[PDB]
Each structure stands twice: as C-alpha cells, then as structure tokens.
Amino acid sequence: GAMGTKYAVPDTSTYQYDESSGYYYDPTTGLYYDPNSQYYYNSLTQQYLYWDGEKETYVPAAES
C-alpha cells in the first residue's frame, strides 16, 4: 500500500457500451464511465471513483 498508484485519463475508446444504463464499461481496467455525470467507478474495488488528475489516482466520489 504505497506504490502502484500510477493512473491517468482512462481510454474512452476502450470502453464498451452497456445498453441498460446507456454508459461505458472498460473491460481492461474494469472502469465505468459516463461523460454526462463525469464520474468513474471501478468495480474491482467496488468503488465509485473520480479522476482528480493531480493525485494521479482514482479518488472515491463518495462525498459525504
């Protein structure tokens, strides 16, 4: 729990289309993405995520 956190902007073309929700799912990273809600989510961690950019990692969009 120190290294491995080298992420960046996900590849939008790598996402496939989920018809039920109407949004993108990327099999390679396991990321969910909606350009409208602008939030991501990684189901491998089961976390609703958000690309900060500065932290170079996916921060949970679980604002409480």
Partner: peptide
C-alpha cells in the same frame, strides 16, 4: 443486487 451500475442510471 451486485456492484454499482455505470455512472448515470437516471430516468
């Protein structure tokens, strides 16, 4: 149900 859904899931 399962994991969460893709961002949105509106109506």
């Amino acid at each position: 149900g399962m994991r969460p859904p893709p961002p949105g899931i509106r109506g």
